[PDB]
């Protein structure tokens, strides 16, 4: 964990995030939806649960991106919840929830659900 | 369970469903989105898991509604997954997934998630 988590991760669709795992549970970094442009970039923040493992368990973690920067304000935020698995083919497997701000009439359509896998390659 | 499940159920928003729980695990009935009109009515089908309980456990169940009838075809289907709890204030507590048919470009926006509680009153 920690050192294994620090670095650049890529999903299937071509989004990228860069994250530092700090000593006491902190995750900080940036998410780029498209690896071309210098602002599809958004701030990310989260937490991971460091633990002694003797059985090859994953490391539980989570992070949030609010979809606002200097070029775009999409009135929404996503959370990813999942686990880090290290080794020669390290990956982070996640499920995600994306919520949009709605009126109260429309609150039943506010939250989409999906899943993502990130690899180092 | 079974006999306790058979009957009319109402959620917070005012939708209604009427269900028969058959002897070997079957749930069949109809869902009306609005209890006024004679077709906001859609077919429902599902299953429940009957079991001897000695500890006051709920009965696990699930059902599907495809949103097509003679007046409307909304190109979508919802599943509800949850449990029946009986007694003087019987309720069914559920979480749901609503999926719309999309092109492959739009498949990340295809599934909404939410929750519902049904009571007899």
């Amino acid at each position: 964990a920690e050192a294994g988590i620090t670095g650049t991760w890529y999903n299937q669709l071509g989004s990228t995030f860069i994250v530092t795992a700090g000593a006491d549970g902190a995750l900080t970094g940036t998410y780029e939806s498209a690896v071309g442009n210098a602002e599809s970039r958004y701030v990310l923040t989260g937490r991971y649960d460091s633990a002694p493992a003797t059985d090859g368990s994953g490391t539980a973690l989570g992070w949030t991106v609010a979809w606002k920067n200097n070029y775009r304000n999409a009135h929404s935020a996503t959370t990813w919840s999942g686990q880090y698995v290290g080794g020669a083919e390290a990956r982070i497997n996640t499920q995600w929830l994306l919520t949009s701000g709605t009126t109260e009439a429309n609150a039943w359509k506010s939250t989409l659900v999906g899943h993502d896998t990130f690899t180092k390659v | 369970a079974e006999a306790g499940i058979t009957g009319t159920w109402y959620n917070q928003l005012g939708s209604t469903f009427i269900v028969t729980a058959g002897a070997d695990g079957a749930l069949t009935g109809t869902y009306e989105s609005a209890v006024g009109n004679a077709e906001s009515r859609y077919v429902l089908t599902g299953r429940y898991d009957s079991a001897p309980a000695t500890d006051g456990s709920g009965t696990a169940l699930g059902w599907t509604v495809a949103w097509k009838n003679n007046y409307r075809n909304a190109h979508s289907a919802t599943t509800w997954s949850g449990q029946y709890v009986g007694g003087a204030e019987a309720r069914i507590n559920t979480q749901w997934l609503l999926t719309s048919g999309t092109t492959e470009a739009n498949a990340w926006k295809s599934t909404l998630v939410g929750h519902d509680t049904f009571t007899k009153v």
């Binding site: 669709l13 989004s15 939806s33 498209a34 599809s40 958004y42 991106v65 979809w67 775009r72 999409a74 929404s76 996503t78 994306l98 | 990340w108 926006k109």
Partner: peptide
């Protein structure tokens, strides 16, 4: 074209 995807 939500920023998560595009």
């Amino acid at each position: 074209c939500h920023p998560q995807f595009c």
